[PDB]
Structures are given as structure tokens and as C-alpha cells.
Design a protein around this ligand. Structure first.
Ligand SMILES: Nc1ncnc2c1ncn2[C@@H]1O[C@H](COP(=O)(O)OP(=O)(O)O)[C@@H](O)[C@H]1O
Ligand code: BEF
Ligand SMILES: [Mg+2]
Ligand SMILES: [Zn+2]
Ligand SMILES: [Zn+2]
Lengths: 135, 385, 98, 42, 188, 129
């Protein structure tokens, strides 16, 4: 789920419930509002997310993709000083499930499986005689 | 005459007939106050050709049965007419026995007045009345401990029974019943279509013939609605008064009867879901499962698993398909693994099942014990607490 | 994700079978080892596994392996609570013997 | 007995008609040419 | 996160950060009788099988429940039964007592009339049922609504997939068109 | 070959105190409950398993499977029972398991001694040096 936001609501723990949260998200076509998920307050507070940016959330992963700031009207967004690479025009509809095609080779898979952090070994070349049963 | 007349006082239909035939007869208990200038008896409503103009006053209301004049007229039209109902003849009934069925929530004043009405107008020498759950033990040979659900036309009831005797201390009621499916069904049809007025049998027969009860939850029903749809044709009131069932794979009749094909994909499942999650229908009803668990909680732990071990169903709410497996799955949940529950609900038909049960009860010694203060120790339920 | 999904199916705990023994060195002696491995094998559990088999027999006499629950045990709930304990504890003591 | 009183006497079906045609015309045909003040005063 | 953050020695609220981002005016998360009133009204309508009877339905529910009809209709959009039972068959029924006034009615009212009506039956004081209602209904809690309560499927197009809720009304919407018209026409 | 008995939402959890010694504080017992599908059942255990499940960071209302052999328990995920608790979330929906409160399954494994001795020689563990 992507779309331009306006502000971010992150509340504290109170008597009634866990927290308070109501994100209004805008796009080119239609703008709506959603609510937090307890963990999402921590996820949004991990980084200093500025109010009014195009950030995409995959609920299957929960990874914030701060691609750029909210385009909306560029009269207030005409002198960023570079940054965000000419932001991005919002696409409108929000509920989208797009497949991701990833191309990998057998070496990457076995190197990843071999060690605790196989990607670092892949990027450094210290694999050291990978065992055959893994292969 | 030892074999009595098996009278089953029901809000929708009152069963009757002798205690010998294997097939009970049908007679709707309602008045068709037709606006076009005619009025019909209890068996002259199914032969009328105009339905878009009617407003009935049923004797049975949310509380109790009210219009005694209509009930008496239906009684004297039913028993004193042997041509309409073959094999049903009785002039006075001085020596004839009688069996009557009524709700457990009957007030003492109603019990006294009704029993006196029987004793004075019909002069039955002996009679016996009890709620439908009390007939379950009669099915020693007669049973002792069962749990009975009475999904009545007015209100659904929960009856714990021990020693063949109801336990009225933990009796629970839930108004969700007949009377209601047609309610949200008609409301949804009016919301998704045009406005229809002055009709009370279209939605009822629609529920009776082309609905079922929520395969396991709301989810299966609300996506499988499209593939398992059925386009019931609304009978246009300009020429027609009764409709028929159509399905996109087993079309009974494909001709447009006065056009106007209604696509019943959505709202096929609302009422079949109000029995457990009324919050979907924006109503604060508990549900049958919450009521039964509350009644069991009030029941002592010594007797709790025994009642859930033998579950039976009474009433016509179970006539529609897809009812036994859902309730079985539900009672499978809630109850922990320590206590195991067995499903022994009647196979659909229950009004006839209760008729057969009371027919059997008329042939045993149970009827000869509490047969005629009359509404106190024989028809009275205080001695059975 | 595509790999660490069958660990809930085909995982086998070699540690459960005591096949990681090399890491379990610096905490044990043998004077308890042989004594317990014999005593708990025969004399400590002869009075337990046989008692729990007797509770199996007690369940059988209780109600037909729960067959006569609604007809015989209908009016008695204490025997119900005995029957819930018997088979559970005998299975747990079988686990204890393994 | 049976039913000595009643036996009908008065029944009448009615309600709606005048507004149904107007609403169907409004939905199937837009409205224009609004009211103008009387010509002779002007 | 980026290293070195500038704090103005004010606000200093690490967990709280927002202004409102409401577009909802009211307090959805924090600070009823309207719910139960509409519930009983739509329940009596659920009892009715006629749409022409709908004007007569409020009169029936006012006569049965006893609550005034005017206030209920403005807000929301059995002794009586014994009374018409007594007046129904004045020519047939004969109400003669048989000592019934001093033998059974006391314990009868203790057992059956412990809760006078269905509303009391669902809220019996002999045990707990409203808390039982909340425990069983694992859908929403009371008072503090941390979820911005909502409703059912697409109300116009009849769609099923991609359901969501409009900001103001809360009327559930799905797909497009109906998701747009149920927002524009129901924009409150 | 080897057989395993495993116990599989969670109804509740509650610890049970005075240590009668120099220890600071502890719980005499811990009582928990598991929902599952084939009926629910409560469970009494030792605060060690309570500590382990606390380290697993599992919500009170959640689906949990607990190993009877050693007590190792991992977060199965957010159960399907508490669906759409809020408008947006990230936890897996994890449909509730269909089975008894406790389940016994037979496992057959085929390994070589070469895996055995390298497993023996290679050390394991967590934060130890
Ligand atoms: N086709 C149907 N679908 C669902 N429910 C039905 C159908 N036909 C009848 N019923 C229900 O069966 C109930 C039977 O109630 P009944 O036993 O007559 O109550 P009582 O015993 O109090 O007179 C009716 O109240 C109605 O709710
Ligand atoms: F009142 Be019913 F339909 F038997
Ligand atoms: Mg009946
Ligand atoms: Zn729609
Ligand atoms: Zn809105």
C-alpha cells in the first residue's frame, strides 16, 4: 500500500487501550484514512519520518519505503534543494498487489545458506569450500 | 376413546388429526385480511390470486397468543369440518382426550384462562399440556437427562432437563427465531432493489424454498455467493402473486415471468449468521451459543457435561438445509476437551417429529398420571422444578 | 521464508536423543549415573508404570473406556474426574519411561 | 360456533401513484425551464 | 536513522508526535444508548414481514416495550398482551379462580418473572451476561474504541472484494464507483 | 525413528509467591490455557516455561505450540481468531490449527554418520563465548 500521507499519528499507552493512531493518506484520485497496528508505531518511530511523504507499506513485510515526499501541490514544494528526485506523482488507487520477480543464481542461495550471514561472505569472497550436502 | 386428537398449537400452523395416522395434516393459523374486499378462513389463503394488498393480524405476538376469537374460529372450523380434513371428525368431545402444546413462558393468568376455555367450550374429560421440551424425555424406557433447544416461531428457548423433568432455574431464551429471517431478508431485498409494499408471503416462501443456513461462517458464504448464486424471480404483482426458484446451473424455468429477474448473490447469508454474530446485523443479541454457555455455567458442574452429551432440536427453524453440521462444528468449539459432546439432533423436520413424539406419548403410561388447581399440579410446572 | 518453512515438519532434535554429547561434558560424574540408570529403570518405576496400568484398568471398570458415560456415569461426576486423570497420567508415565 | 360477526364489510386497497410517475420521469428525464414571474407585472 | 537529532529543549515528546491528522472532528479512539435503541428498533423491524406495516411498526413497538414513540423515532430512524387477551374473548372465556392466587403464583413469579421482559432477560441480575456478551463477541470492546468502528459489505454495487471505510461516514465501501458514490452521497 | 507429543489459540496465562529464602521473587506455579480446534484445555507449568514464552514475545491472545520434550516454544504468529484487530497490521494471520490440544506424531529421519560427527564436533548455542 502506497500513497501520499499528510501527518503521522503516534500516541502513548493509556488506560483505554494500547495506543491511538489514524493515518490519513492522500493520492491523485481518492484519499482515505487507516489505523495503526501496535508494532507500526515502533516501525514509524524507528526513523524520523517527515509529515507529508510518499511512503509504501507491504503488510506482508511492514517495510516503509520512503521513496519521496508528497507531490500534491508543488507550490510549497518547489525549493526542496534537490532531494527526493522530483518526488513522485501519486498513482491514485492504493490497494495493489504486484508480484516481484527476483533473479538469483545457485551460488548466491548456497552461500546464503552456508553461514549465519552469507550475504557478507558473498560480498567478500570468504565462502571457504562450501559443503556438498547443502548443494 | 383412549386415542386423543394430536393438537399442536403452533403460531404458524396448528397440527391436528387422530392418534393413529402416520401423516399429520396441515392448517395455517392466520387470517388473510385482503384489502380487495374479501376475507379468508384458516385454509382459504393458498387459493387467492392477489397478494399486493393484504394486512394480517396474527393471533400470536411477540409476547403470547392474543386474538382468541381467531383461534376459536379456527378451532371450530378445523374440528367440525370433516370434508376439508379427511378422517378428522369430532362433534363435542365429552369423552375424547386432548393434548395441547404451548410455550413455557405462559403466564399463570393465560394458563388458567386457556385451560378453562378448553374445559368449558370443548368439555374434554382429560387433557395435558406442557412445553415442547417436556416431550423429549418421553421419546425406565422414557429418558431422564437431555438438553433441548426450542427454536420457536416467536422465541428460541434453551431447556435443561434432568430426571425427565425440566430445570427451569437455568432456562434461557433468545428471541431470534422465525419472524426474523424474513425481516432482514425483506429489508435487504428492499435496499438492493425497488420498494415493495403490502406483502407478507413472498419473503417467507423465499426463505422456505431458496435459502439455507451459512455453510460454516460469513466468509464462505460471502465469497461463494457468486458461484452459488440463484436468481429468484420476484412475481410481479400486476399479473402474478407467487414466485419460483432459479439457479444459474440448474434452471427450473428460464422464461421471464413478467420479467424482473432478481440476482440474489449477496444477502444470502445474513440471518443464518445472526445466530452467533448479530453484530454484523447491528443488533446486540447474544446468540444461541452464548445463551447455551451461560445456561451451562449456571448449571452445576456435576450436571454440565451430561446435558451437552445429548443435544436435540425442536421447531421448524431446522427445516432449511445446512443446519446440523454448522451447529455441530460450533458445539465442537467452546466446550473444552475435558467434556465431549455428541450430536443427536432430529433430521430436519421437527413439528412432525414432535407430533410423532406426542403420538408415542399418548400410548404410554406417562399420559395417565398427570391428566385431569388444574393449572397448578398437572398443567403447572412448579411441581417439575 | 521459502526455505525455513519445513522446519515445522521435518526437524529432528539430535539433542533430544543425546547426540550432542560433546557439549555436555563439564557437569557430570558416574556414581549417580549407573545407580540411577538402573534404579529408576527397574525399582523406581515398577511402582509407577504398574500403578498407572492399574489406573487403566480402573478406567475400564469406571466406564468401558468412556462408553457408558451418558447411561452409567450420568449421575456421578467424581468418577468422571477420576477418568480424566487416569489415562492422561498413564500416557505421561509412558513418556517418563521413554 | 364459527364467526357470527364481521364477515367482511369494508376493505380498500390504495396508497401511492401520483408521485411514482413524477419520480420516474425525473430520474429518466432531467428538469429545466424553471418558474418565471408573471408576464403582465413585468 | 540519521545521526545527530536537534532538540529545541521544548516539546521533548519522544513517543507523541502528531497534530491531529484526524479528518474526523470527533475522538474516534477515546472520549452507547443509541446503539441499543437502534438495535431494538431494527429488531422490531426484523420482526415485521411487511413494508406497508413499517409506518405502523413504531406504534406497535411503543405499545409493547412501553417507551414513548416520539423520542425513539426522533433519536432512531407482557401486561398489554394480557390486556388484549382479556378483551379478545369476553364472550367465551370465564376467568374463575381455583385457589390459584395463593398456591403457585409466588414461586412462579420468582422463577419465570425474575426478569420482567426480554431486555431484562438478556441483562439478568442473577449472573453476568453483558460482560459475557463482550467476552463471547470477540469483535469490539466498549467505550474506548481503538479501531474506529465500522460496518458491512458494499451497500450499492454488491461487491465483495477490496473493502474499506470512508473517512467521515464510516460506511463500508469496496472496489470503485460504489466505493465513490457511497462516499460522495454519504459524506457527513 | 522417534515419536513426539506436542501441545497446540491461548486462552489465558497466570503465574502463581514467597520464595521462603534469600531469592528476590518468583512464582510457585504458572497456569495457562490453549484453545486449538478440537476443544481447549488449561495447562499448569513451571515459571521456566513462562520465562521462555516471555522471551518468545507472544501476545496473551495468540496461537502457541509448546514442545513437551524440552519446553522449547516459538511464536506461531497472530492467530486467525483475532483477525482485523486494527485497520492495518503486519503479523501473519496464521489460521488456527485443526487438531487436539495435544498431538502425537511419528517422525522418521534418515541421516549419515558424517552428519553425526560433524554435529558433535561443531559447537552450538546462543550468546555464550
Ligand atoms: N423454512 C423455515 N426456515 C426457518 N425457520 C422456520 C421455517 N419454517 C418454520 N420455521 C421456524 O420454526 C419455528 C417453529 O416454532 P413452534 O414450534 O411453532 O413454536 P411454538 O412451539 O412456541 O408454537 C417457527 O417459529 C419458525 O421460527
Ligand atoms: F410456529 Be411454527 F412454524 F411451528
Ligand atoms: Mg411446535
Ligand atoms: Zn457498492
Ligand atoms: Zn464518509
Amino acid at each position: 500500500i502506497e500513497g501520499e500521507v499528510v501527518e503521522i499519528q503516534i500516541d502513548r499507552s493509556i488506560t483505554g487501550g494500547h495506543k491511538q493512531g489514524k493515518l490519513t493518506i492522500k493520492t491523485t484520485d481518492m484519499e482515505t484514512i487507516y489505523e495503526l497496528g501496535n508494532k507500526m508505531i515502533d516501525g514509524l518511530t524507528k526513523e524520523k519520518v517527515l509529515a507529508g511523504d510518499v511512503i509504501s507499506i507491504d503488510k506482508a513485510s511492514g517495510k516503509i519505503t520512503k521513496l519521496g515526499r508528497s507531490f500534491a501541490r508543488s507550490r510549497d514544494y518547489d525549493a526542496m534543494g534537490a532531494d527526493t528526485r522530483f518526488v513522485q506523482c501519486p498513482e491514485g488507487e492504493l490497494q495493489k498487489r504486484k508480484t516481484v520477480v527476483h533473479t538469483v543464481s545457485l551460488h548466491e542461495i548456497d552461500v546464503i545458506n552456508s553461514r549465519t550471514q552469507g550475504f557478507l561472505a558473498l560480498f567478500t569472497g570468504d565462502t571457504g569450500e562450501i559443503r556438498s550436502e547443502v548443494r | 376413546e383412549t386415542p386423543p386428537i394430536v393438537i399442536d398449537n403452533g403460531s404458524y400452523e396448528i397440527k391436528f388429526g387422530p392418534s393413529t395416522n402416520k401423516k399429520p395434516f396441515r392448517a395455517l393459523n392466520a387470517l388473510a385480511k385482503d384489502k380487495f374486499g374479501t376475507s379468508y378462513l384458516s385454509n382459504h389463503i393458498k387459493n387467492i390470486k392477489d397478494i399486493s394488498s393484504i394486512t394480517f393480524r396474527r393471533p400470536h405476538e411477540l409476547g403470547q397468543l392474543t386474538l382468541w376469537e381467531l383461534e376459536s374460529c379456527i378451532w371450530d372450523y378445523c374440528l367440525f369440518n370433516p370434508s376439508e380434513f379427511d378422517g378428522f371428525d369430532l362433534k363435542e368431545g365429552k369423552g375424547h382426550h386432548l393434548v395441547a402444546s404451548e410455550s413455557c413462558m405462559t403466564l399463570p393468568e393465560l394458563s388458567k384462562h386457556a385451560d378453562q376455555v378448553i374445559f368449558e367450550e370443548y368439555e374434554f374429560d382429560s387433557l395435558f399440556k406442557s412445553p415442547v421440551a417436556v416431550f423429549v424425555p418421553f421419546t425406565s424406557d422414557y429418558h431422564d437427562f437431555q438438553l433441548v433447544i426450542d427454536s420457536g416461531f416467536n422465541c428460541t428457548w434453551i431447556i435443561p432437563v434432568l430426571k425427565g423433568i425440566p430445570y427451569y432455574k437455568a432456562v434461557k431464551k433468545l428471541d431470534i427465531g422465525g419472524r426474523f429471517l424474513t425481516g432482514l431478508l425483506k429489508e435487504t431485498l428492499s435496499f438492493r432493489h425497488y420498494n415493495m409494499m403490502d406483502e407478507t408471503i413472498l419473503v417467507n416462501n423465499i426463505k422456505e424454498q431458496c435459502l439455507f443456513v451459512s455453510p460454516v461462517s460469513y466468509f464462505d458464504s460471502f465469497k461463494t455467493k457468486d458461484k452459488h448464486a440463484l436468481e429468484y424471480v420476484l412475481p410481479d404483482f400486476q399479473t402474478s402473486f407467487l414466485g419460483y426458484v432459479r439457479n444459474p446451473r440448474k434452471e427450473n424455468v428460464p422464461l421471464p415471468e413478467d420479467a424482473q429477474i432478481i440476482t440474489l448473490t449477496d444477502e444470502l447469508f445474513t440471518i443464518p449468521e445472526t445466530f452467533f454474530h448479530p453484530e454484523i446485523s447491528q443488533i446486540t443479541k447474544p446468540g444461541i451459543v452464548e445463551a447455551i454457555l451461560e445456561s451451562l455455567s449456571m448449571l452445576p458442574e456435576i450436571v454440565r457435561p451430561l446435558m451437552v452429551g445429548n443435544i436435540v432440536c425442536t421447531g421448524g427453524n431446522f427445516n432449511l438445509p445446512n443446519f446440523a453440521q454448522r451447529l455441530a462444528a460450533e458445539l465442537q468449539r467452546q466446550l473444552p476437551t475435558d467434556w465431549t459432546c455428541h450430536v443427536s439432533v432430529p433430521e430436519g423436520d421437527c413439528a412432525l417429529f414432535g407430533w410423532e413424539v406426542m403420538s408415542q406419548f399418548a400410548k404410554t403410561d406417562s399420559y395417565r398420571k398427570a391428566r385431569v388447581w388444574c393449572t397448578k399440579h398437572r398443567f403447572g410446572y412448579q411441581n417439575w422444578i | 521464508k521459502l526455505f525455513k518453512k519445513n522446519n515445522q515438519v521435518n526437524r529432528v532434535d539430535l539433542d533430544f536423543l543425546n547426540l550432542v554429547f560433546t557439549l555436555n561434558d563439564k557437569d557430570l560424574t558416574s556414581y549417580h549415573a549407573e545407580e540411577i540408570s538402573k534404579l529408576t529403570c527397574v525399582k523406581n518405576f515398577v511402582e509407577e508404570v504398574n500403578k498407572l496400568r492399574e489406573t487403566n484398568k480402573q478406567l475400564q471398570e469406571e466406564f468401558g473406556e468412556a462408553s457408558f458415560l451418558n447411561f452409567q456415569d450420568a449421575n456421578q461426576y467424581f468418577k468422571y474426574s477420576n477418568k480424566q486423570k487416569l489415562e492422561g497420567t498413564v500416557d505421561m508415565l509412558n513418556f517418563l519411561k521413554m | 360456533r364459527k364467526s357470527a360477526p364481521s364477515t367482511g364489510g369494508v376493505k380498500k386497497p390504495h396508497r401511492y401513484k401520483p408521485g411514482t410517475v413524477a419520480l420516474r420521469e425525473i430520474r429518466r428525464f432531467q428538469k429545466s425551464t424553471e418558474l418565471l414571474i408573471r408576464k403582465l407585472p413585468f | 536513522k540519521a545521526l545527530v537529532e536537534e532538540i529545541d529543549k521544548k516539546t521533548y515528546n519522544p513517543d507523541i508526535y502528531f497534530t491531529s491528522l484526524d479528518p474526523q472532528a470527533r475522538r474516534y479512539t477515546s472520549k452507547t444508548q443509541q446503539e441499543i435503541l437502534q438495535s431494538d428498533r431494527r429488531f422490531m423491524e426484523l420482526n415485521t414481514e411487511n413494508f406497508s406495516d413499517l409506518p405502523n411498526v413504531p406504534t406497535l413497538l411503543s405499545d409493547l416495550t412501553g417507551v414513548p414513540r416520539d423520542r425513539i423515532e426522533s433519536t432512531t430512524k407482557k401486561p398489554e398482551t394480557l390486556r388484549e387477551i382479556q378483551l379478545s374473548y369476553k364472550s367465551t372465556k370465564l376467568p374463575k379462580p381455583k385457589r390459584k392466587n395463593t398456591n403457585r403464583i409466588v414461586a412462579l413469579k420468582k422463577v419465570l418473572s425474575s426478569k420482567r421482559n426480554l431486555h431484562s432477560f438478556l441483562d439478568s441480575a442473577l449472573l453476568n451476561l453483558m460482560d459475557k456478551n463482550v467476552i463471547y463477541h470477540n469483535v469490539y470492546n466498549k467505550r474506548y474504541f481503538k479501531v474506529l468502528p465500522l460496518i458491512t459489505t458494499c451497500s450499492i454495487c454488491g461487491g465483495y472484494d477490496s473493502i474499506s471505510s470512508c473517512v467521515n461516514c464510516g460506511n463500508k465501501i469496496c472496489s470503485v464507483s460504489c466505493f465513490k458514490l457511497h462516499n460522495e452521497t454519504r459524506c457527513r | 525413528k522417534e515419536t513426539k507429543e506436542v501441545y497446540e489459540e491461548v486462552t489465558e496465562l497466570t503465574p502463581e509467591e514467597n520464595p521462603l529464602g534469600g531469592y528476590g521473587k518468583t512464582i510457585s506455579h504458572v497456569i495457562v490455557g490453549l484453545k486449538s480446534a478440537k476443544g481447549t484445555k488449561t495447562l499448569r507449568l513451571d515459571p521456566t516455561i513462562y520465562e521462555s514464552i516471555q522471551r518468545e514475545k507472544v501476545s496473551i491472545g495468540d496461537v502457541i505450540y509448546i514442545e513437551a520434550n524440552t519446553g522449547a516454544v516459538k511464536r506461531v504468529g497472530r492467530s486467525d481468531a483475532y483477525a482485523t484487530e486494527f485497520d492495518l497490521e503486519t503479523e501473519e494471520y496464521v489460521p488456527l490449527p485443526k487438531g487436539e490440544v495435544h498431538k502425537k506424531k511419528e517422525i522418521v529421519q534418515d541421516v549419515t554418520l558424517h552428519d553425526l560427527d560433524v554435529a558433535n564436533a561443531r559447537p552450538q548455542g546462543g550468546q555464550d563465548v
